[PDB]
Amino acid sequence: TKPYVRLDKNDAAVLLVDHQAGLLSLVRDIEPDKFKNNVLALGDLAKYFNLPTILTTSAETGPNGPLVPELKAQFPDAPYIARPGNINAWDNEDFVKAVKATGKKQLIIAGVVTEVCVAFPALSAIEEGFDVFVVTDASGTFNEITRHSAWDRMSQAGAQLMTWFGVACELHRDWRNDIAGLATLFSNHIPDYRNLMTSYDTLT
Amino acid sequence: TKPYVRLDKNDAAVLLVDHQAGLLSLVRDIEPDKFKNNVLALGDLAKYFNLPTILTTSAETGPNGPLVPELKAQFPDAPYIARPGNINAWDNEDFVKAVKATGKKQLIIAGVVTEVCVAFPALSAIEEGFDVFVVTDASGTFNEITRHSAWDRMSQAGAQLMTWFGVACELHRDWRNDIAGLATLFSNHIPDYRNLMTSYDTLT
Amino acid sequence: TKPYVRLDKNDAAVLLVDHQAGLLSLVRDIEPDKFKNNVLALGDLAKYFNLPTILTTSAETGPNGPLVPELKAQFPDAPYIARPGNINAWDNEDFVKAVKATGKKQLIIAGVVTEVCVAFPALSAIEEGFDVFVVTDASGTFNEITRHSAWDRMSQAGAQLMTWFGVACELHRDWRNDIAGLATLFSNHIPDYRNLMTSYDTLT
Amino acid sequence: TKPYVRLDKNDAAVLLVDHQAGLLSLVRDIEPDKFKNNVLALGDLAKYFNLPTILTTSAETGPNGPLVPELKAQFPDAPYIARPGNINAWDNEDFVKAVKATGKKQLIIAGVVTEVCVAFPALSAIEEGFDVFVVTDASGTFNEITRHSAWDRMSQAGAQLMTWFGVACELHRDWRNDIAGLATLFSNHIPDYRNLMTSYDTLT
Amino acid sequence: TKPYVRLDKNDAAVLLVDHQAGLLSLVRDIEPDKFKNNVLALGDLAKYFNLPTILTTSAETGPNGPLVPELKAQFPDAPYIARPGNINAWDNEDFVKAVKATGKKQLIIAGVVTEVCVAFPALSAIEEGFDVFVVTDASGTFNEITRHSAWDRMSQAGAQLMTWFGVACELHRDWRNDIAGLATLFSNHIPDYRNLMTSYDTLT
Amino acid sequence: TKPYVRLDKNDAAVLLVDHQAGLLSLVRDIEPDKFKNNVLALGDLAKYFNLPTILTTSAETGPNGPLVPELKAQFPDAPYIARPGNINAWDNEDFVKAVKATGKKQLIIAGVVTEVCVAFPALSAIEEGFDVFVVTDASGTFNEITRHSAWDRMSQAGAQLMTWFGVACELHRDWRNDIAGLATLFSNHIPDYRNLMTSYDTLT
Amino acid sequence: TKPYVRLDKNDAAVLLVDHQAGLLSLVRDIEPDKFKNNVLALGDLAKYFNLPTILTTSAETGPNGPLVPELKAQFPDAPYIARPGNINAWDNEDFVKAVKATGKKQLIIAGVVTEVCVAFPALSAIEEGFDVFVVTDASGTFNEITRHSAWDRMSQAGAQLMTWFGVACELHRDWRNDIAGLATLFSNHIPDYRNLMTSYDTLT
Amino acid sequence: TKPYVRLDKNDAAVLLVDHQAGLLSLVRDIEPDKFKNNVLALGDLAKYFNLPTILTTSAETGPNGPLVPELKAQFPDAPYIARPGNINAWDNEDFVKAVKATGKKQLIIAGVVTEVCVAFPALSAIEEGFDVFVVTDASGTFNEITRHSAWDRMSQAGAQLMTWFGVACELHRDWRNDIAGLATLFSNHIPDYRNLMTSYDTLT
Structure with missing residues (x-):
């Protein structure tokens, strides 16, 4: 039937577009604490899975502001395209x-x-x-x-809508490939999971 | 694959249908301060991009009321179809x-x-x-x-669901085409963006 | 392109399924005051447009309860199928x-x-x-x-999702066909519209 | 047109995936009292309709935790696949x-x-x-x-989105097949329905 | 301790202030169907308990609009103060x-x-x-x-915050004083209660 | 300063007023699954702490309906006052x-x-x-x-607003008084706590 | 009883504290379009009623940013205290x-x-x-x-919680003092009122 | 009038009660990403202002779980009271x-x-x-x-309801006491403030 077109850690690149300091103030559909954690989670998974990553910004020398420092620091050798107008x-x-x-x-x-x-x-x-x-x-x-208008438009075109934890799981496929590594990513970005780890670790 | 059918400032017309004083009181899915700003933003972008614009009203000489003054004033030469019944x-x-x-x-x-x-x-x-x-x-x-029932119905038929800021960006394509103009439109309709401009401007 | 398959007052029937007294207590996705008004609005429009209407109930002689009195009273000659099990x-x-x-x-x-x-x-x-x-x-x-799971399922199959006011407007097509009649339906079921009428009427 | 591919109690299996004690703490899109009732409702209907059921867990000997006791107790002879990594x-x-x-x-x-x-x-x-x-x-x-991103992705692929009560009704088809049995399932999992039963029962 | 200062049907007056057609469009903290029902419920209970009622409006011959017709019609002999400026x-x-x-x-x-x-x-x-x-x-x-700021201000001053159903019950005190009357008020303004009544009546 | 007037298991009585099958359909401020769990939790804690409990109903032989079966069954010797009108x-x-x-x-x-x-x-x-x-x-x-208007009114008079879990903890004071008992109450009425217990138990 | 301590246009001063471009990005409890309108409404009413107004900022030469331009422009002679640390x-x-x-x-x-x-x-x-x-x-x-914690704290101390429209009405007292002035303030800051005005004006 | 009883960094102690790994799964009134950030912000400010801090846990060797690691690590010399039952x-x-x-x-x-x-x-x-x-x-x-019932109860008794940022500002009093320190606390726990800082810093 419809093939399951799933993420393949060897055939995927990550595009991080305009996560700029000024532009983040415009983000109000997802609260800031959650949004910051999610963006950093995505950067961490891109790094963890070693996926070729591309950074780009829009008119960063203006109100839009610079790319958030974390991403810049995390991908120092990645292509960095500062778009002056497009x-x-x-x-x-x-x-x-x-x-x-x-x-x-x-x-x-x-x-x-x-x-x-x-x-x-x-x-x-x-x-x-x-x-x-x-x-x-x-x-x-x-x-x-x-947000929802955009989801509809992207889905209509054939884009697969996913969330970071789902992305990490589809890429990893198997815990045994590296338990500690995935566990660390999850613990660092999911307070609830970190708590489960804490209890389990102190008990075992 | 699916072609990206994007807005072309030379091949687009704007239809503003029944934004009437009486009818606006029926609008409760989007709060009034945001709704007013968005409608005016759309009018401003239509004017800014010079897109042929068509105004129409339904039984305006009744409870429905007259077209909000801003639109009438902004497009004095545009076709104005006061529909008596359709x-x-x-x-x-x-x-x-x-x-x-x-x-x-x-x-x-x-x-x-x-x-x-x-x-x-x-x-x-x-x-x-x-x-x-x-x-x-x-x-x-x-x-x-x-609202959502309508979105489903329009999307199902092939309509592309967009929002005003997205519309402006797809039409403009490049900041360099006129930075000040687009910036003014954004500053006038996005308090958060205006604030970024204020800080940037006083500092530079 | 995709044809606009719109309601035709001469080619449409209304099916009112299980709006029973007991079953209405299970309805919590739409608050009761709004839900009651909407159901009665639908009955009123079916009557107004003279659309063949079919009433049906499920195990009404049990917890499900009888059909709400309004519908029974409004369509005394309509087919009434009390389903004992299906x-x-x-x-x-x-x-x-x-x-x-x-x-x-x-x-x-x-x-x-x-x-x-x-x-x-x-x-x-x-x-x-x-x-x-x-x-x-x-x-x-x-x-x-x-609710949303059902919408997805029905839309996926080709059902057109509509709301009562939209249904009435698509059926009527033109105010001039009977202004007072449609206005009465709206005034009786849309407090905001009734208010617009009150102001307009006392002023004119 | 599009065929109605409805659940057939003789051609359906139930897959209960990772409803584990630790993992349930991550569930925040559906409040716990409702979520617990719904999961147990699903288990009860699977048992009631005698549908072949498959239980599976992910790294249950870790933070993820054991399968909730109810499911384990309810399907003691069902295939139980404790996945160590997939x-x-x-x-x-x-x-x-x-x-x-x-x-x-x-x-x-x-x-x-x-x-x-x-x-x-x-x-x-x-x-x-x-x-x-x-x-x-x-x-x-x-x-x-x-959640919604996942719904979009599954629906896009052809999955039918349903809810437990709908699942039970599509499977049962007719009350007369066993009134007391279905009524018991509903009464145990829908407080509103149980209340309707209580009133009806004490009166009759 | 603190005395229970309860409503006494023989020592209470009702003041209905500015429920005007125009002004009701400004009401967005309570949705219209519920609001209309509640205002009409209060008018009905004031009439039912024969409480001296005072109607008043603010600049009714202007955008504010006339008093909603129902209140005017329900209290034809009540003092009606059209305030021209206060x-x-x-x-x-x-x-x-x-x-x-x-x-x-x-x-x-x-x-x-x-x-x-x-x-x-x-x-x-x-x-x-x-x-x-x-x-x-x-x-x-x-x-x-x-709304909440006003509640705080009024409560801080000593006002007792109540809601229409509570008002009706505190005034009535005992069902036996007139079961049918109170039941009718409730049935006309609480769809859930009306449903309970329908099921009970058809059964008994 | 202000004394902490805390619940004393030897100087407290529980009054359960009108938790009737019909009347519960009117409850919409708290969703049914949670509400049912909370009411049953309160009944369980009243029984657990052996507090004198009083059951009362209002016009139970009418639309209001009978007391929910669980409370009747749980307190067979408690005073049960069927109020005919007050x-x-x-x-x-x-x-x-x-x-x-x-x-x-x-x-x-x-x-x-x-x-x-x-x-x-x-x-x-x-x-x-x-x-x-x-x-x-x-x-x-x-x-x-x-709900909130009532909270304001009750608090204004001096009532202490509490919730069932808080009530249980204030009455119990110390886990050591009976760990298993309190743990069972919590496990039966707080899915999250039950999950914590399941993981802890299987591990230890 | 408790005296009604109401705003007196001759005994009131307005303190506008830290409405700075940077700090406004931190405001997420009230959406931006509404917030901007409300702040500008307060500035307008302060100017309209000729109330002594004091502007103050906190570390404006830093991330906090400058005072929003409108307030500075509206009160050019008002005391402007740039606080360097307090x-x-x-x-x-x-x-x-x-x-x-x-x-x-x-x-x-x-x-x-x-x-x-x-x-x-x-x-x-x-x-x-x-x-x-x-x-x-x-x-x-x-x-x-x-926000609510602050309301509680301020109210507990005796502060009166008000909102801009209420502030304007309490200060004005009587429409007749200057109908056009107050009407303009309202029209400029309440889209619903402006719509009422438009319909009324075109009709009369 | 009522004295402003404000936090004094030399007369305040911090009590962190039961922020345990297991118990945090019960927290659903505040989402996890925000909650984690807020708890860690409070721990950071307590350490920053050198306030005597007391850590305490309830039945930590059971489902409740251990104190979250960060607090233990941050206050190694603080009194740590593991309560076995109270x-x-x-x-x-x-x-x-x-x-x-x-x-x-x-x-x-x-x-x-x-x-x-x-x-x-x-x-x-x-x-x-x-x-x-x-x-x-x-x-x-x-x-x-x-939550709100507890706020009411605590406020009724005279407790002052505050939030971490307010706590930090009331304790600090003046930026000049240590700009960098307070700025770091804010930057580490308020993504919006951090963004303001990033833009300001890169520009200056």
Whole structure:
């Protein structure tokens, strides 16, 4: 029937679009403590799984502000495309070149705002033949209407809507591949899971 | 794959349907301060991008009331079709004529109520072969159920659900085309963005 | 493109499924004051537009309770199928016979609970070739999850999700067909509209 | 048109995935009192309808914890696959073997978390040709975003989204098949229905 | 300890302040169907218990609009003070004179907006020595912040916050005083109670 | 300063007012699964701590319905006052005589609806000198406005607003008094605690 | 009884504390469109009623940012105290001296964040003998918990919780004092009122 | 008037009650990411201001679980009272002796669950003459009803309801006392503030 097009840690690249200091103030559909944790979780999983990662920003030398320091620090050697004008990152030639240079068929995309910086390149990438996976809990926007309208638009085009924990699990496939590593990622980003670990660890 | 059918500032017309004084009191799915800002934002972007715009009202000489003054004042030369009876604007011959006279393939539609004044002509237009883009945050209705039911119906038919900021960004494409102009539109309609500008401006 | 399959007052029948006194206590996804008004609005529009209407109940001589008095009183000559056991009304031969006897291609369906008494016959009817329109604001269920899951299932099958005011507007098409009649229906079921009428009437 | 692919009590198996003590603490999209009742309702209906049932857990000898006692106690002879590493149950050979051994075409799936333990095997099963029915109110996850993203993904693939009461009704088809039995299931899991029964019973 | 200052049907007057057609459009803290039902319930109970009732409006010949027709029709002989400018009804001499002429110590107050038309006269009345009971569910305002701030202010001054059903029960005291009358009031304004009545009646 | 007037298991009585099958359908401020669990938790703790308990109903032979079976079954020897007309239970002589016969200074009260069946007797009791503790999560009403207004009124009079778990902990004081007993109460009424217990037990 | 301590336009001063561009990004308990409108409404009413107004900022030459431009522009001659370190404005000598120099007994306070920049000086002022009125809808903070805790603290101390429209009406007292002026204030800050005005005006 | 009883960094002690790994799973009134951040923020501010801090746990060798690792690690020399049975920490002699040994008049309290582990000792402390400040956003419970009922009870007794950021600002008083220190605390626990800092720093 419909094939299950699942994330393959050897055929996926991560695109982090415009998670900038100024732009994050516009994010109100997901509260800040949760949003910050989710964005950092996504960066950590990209690093953990060793997925080619591409960073891009929009007019960072203005109100939009610089890329949040964590991402910059975490991916010092990753392609960093500071777009001076193109709103849709896919319209930037350097950006597309970097994406295609990863040689990956699957693109895991997250950024701000959801309906512009994520949706535009997601739609462009789908037209180009890529398998697109949107991390909806690591992408932010004005409110639930701007968010849900974007979800509808991306889903309609064929984008798979996923969340960071789901992304990590589909990529990892098996705990035995590295229990401690995945457990650390989860403990660092899911207070409830960390608590379960604490109790289990002190008891055993 | 699925082509990205994106807004083209040279191939799009804006249809503002029944944003009337009386009818706005029926809008309860989007709070008034946000709704007013969004509707005015849509009018401002239509003017900014110079998109052929069509205004229409339903039984304005009754409880429905007159078109909100801002729109009337902003588009004094635009086609203004006061429909005496047709609920679906597409059933009004003058309305369809005005729409087709714009010569635009893409129609950006917003109005009240979402499930009637927006959905009916959106569905009619899709049947006629137009590419329809619904501005969900500049369209209002009774509640979330009447709204979401309409979204489902329009999406099912092929309408692209968008929000005003997304619409502006897809139309503009590149900041460099006119930075100050887009920045002004954003500053006037996004308090958070205006604040970022204020801080940046006083510092630089 | 996709044809706009709109309600035709001459080709539509209304199916009111299990709006029973006991069963209404299970409805918690739509608050009671709004739900009661919406159900009565649907009955009033069915009567106003003279649409063949079919009433049905499930094990009414038990906890489920009798059909709410208003509907019984409003459609004294309509087919009334008290199903002794079949959960999906479409599984009741008398019910299907009554539906087909209306000779109508379009079926406007509402009832309780949304995911069972509305969804089951809606899906059965779609398989039989009928054009189905679900009145989502006149159908009730346990909570938003049971509701939204049902919406997804019905939409997936091809059901058009609509709300009562939208249904009335698509059926009427033109105010001039009978202004006072439609205005009365609206005034009786939309407090906000009634208020607009009051102000307009005392002023003119 | 689209066939109504409805649950058949003779052609359906139930898969209960990772409803573990530790993992249930991660469920925050559905409040605990409702979630517990729903999960137990699903187990009770599986038992009532005599549907082949498969239990599976993920790294139960760790923070994830043991399967909740109720399920273990209710299905002592059911296949119980304690997966030591595979996140997607479908990747476990014993699990798939047990599923296929039931000889059932329809799979009713529920578990935690929705977007991983339910979605992954649901998608895998759809690819294998099974008719999948997801019990959305007996599956739990972090929040509404992780949940709704998963719903979109499963629906997109062809999964039918259902809720436990709907599942029971589609399976039973007719009250007369066993009134007391279904009534007991409902009374035990729907406080509102139990109240209707109490009043009716004391009066009659 | 603190005395229970309860409503006495022989020492209470009802003040209905500014429930006008225009002003009701400003009420967004309580949805319209519920609000309409609650206001009409309060009018019905005032009439039922034969309580001296005072109607008052603010600049009714302007955007504020006329008093909702039902109240005017229900209390044709009640004092009706059309205030031409005084915002706080207590500042209008005719209004205060009317309140004092009732000879009642207890004042049941409701109106729109709650923080102005209800709060101002309630605070004035408390200063004057009256026992004030505010009907919070028959008073409307902009949002929950304007509402809750007013509740705090009124409660801080000593006003007793009540809701229409509670008001009716405190006034009635005993069902046996007139079962049918109170039952009718409840049936007409509480859909859930009406349903209970329908089931009970058809069975007995 | 202000003395901590805490629950004393030897000086407290429990008043369960009108938790009737019909009346529970009116409870919409607290969802049914949680509400049922909370009411049964209060009944369980009253039995566990051997507190003198008084059951009372209002017009049970009518739409209001019988007392929920569990309470009747749990307190077979408790005073059971079927009030034929008095809305405020304190106005019923048998009720007050029973309360006073317990000899308890502290009264733990819960019932439906909170603003009438709980608030009225609570206010009456406070006037009489009793220390009143309202169990807000085992008392139900129409919505949050009817609930919060009642809380304000009760708190204003001096009632202490508590919830069942807090009630249990304040009465118990020390785990060591009977660990297993309190643990069982908690396990039976708090799914999260039960899960903690399951994991801990299987591990130790 | 308790005196109604109402706003007197001749004995009130307005304190606008820290409505800075940077600090406004921290405000998430009230959405931005509404918040901006409310802050500007308060500034407009302060100017309209000619109330002595005091502007103050905290570390404006840093992340906190400059005062929003509108307030600066609207009150060019008002005392403007840039506090270099004192968090509670009352601890700044110039600030207190300015407040006392107004000679006003009543202080209308608003600012960000509500639990610090508003609450601290409000509590200080109350201790000093001033009558404090907090504008809760023109004060912003992190979330509803930080907000409601502050309301509790301020109310507990004796502050009167008000909202901008209520503030305007209490100060104005009578429409006839200047109908057009108050009407303009309302029209500019309440979309629903503006709509009422539009319909009324076009009709008359 | 009422004195402003403000936090004094030299006369305040911090009581962290039962923030245990198991018990945190019961916290559902505040989402986990925010709750974790708030608890860690309170621990950080207690350490920053060098306030005598007391850690206490309830039956930690059981389902309740161990104290979250961060608090243990942050306060290695703080009194740590493992209570073997006393639910209200004030009933534990070592606990009270430790509180009194600090010599502090003001007690900043936080813990889980708010209506038991925080409320009980807060009420006990108030009776003993202490000035109690409850950190409502670093205290967790089952839901909003259990939370708000506790707030009411604590406030009624005289406790001051505060939140961590407010606590930090009231203790600090002046930025100049140590700008970098307070800024770091804020940056580490308020993503919005951190973003403001990032933009400001890169620009200056």
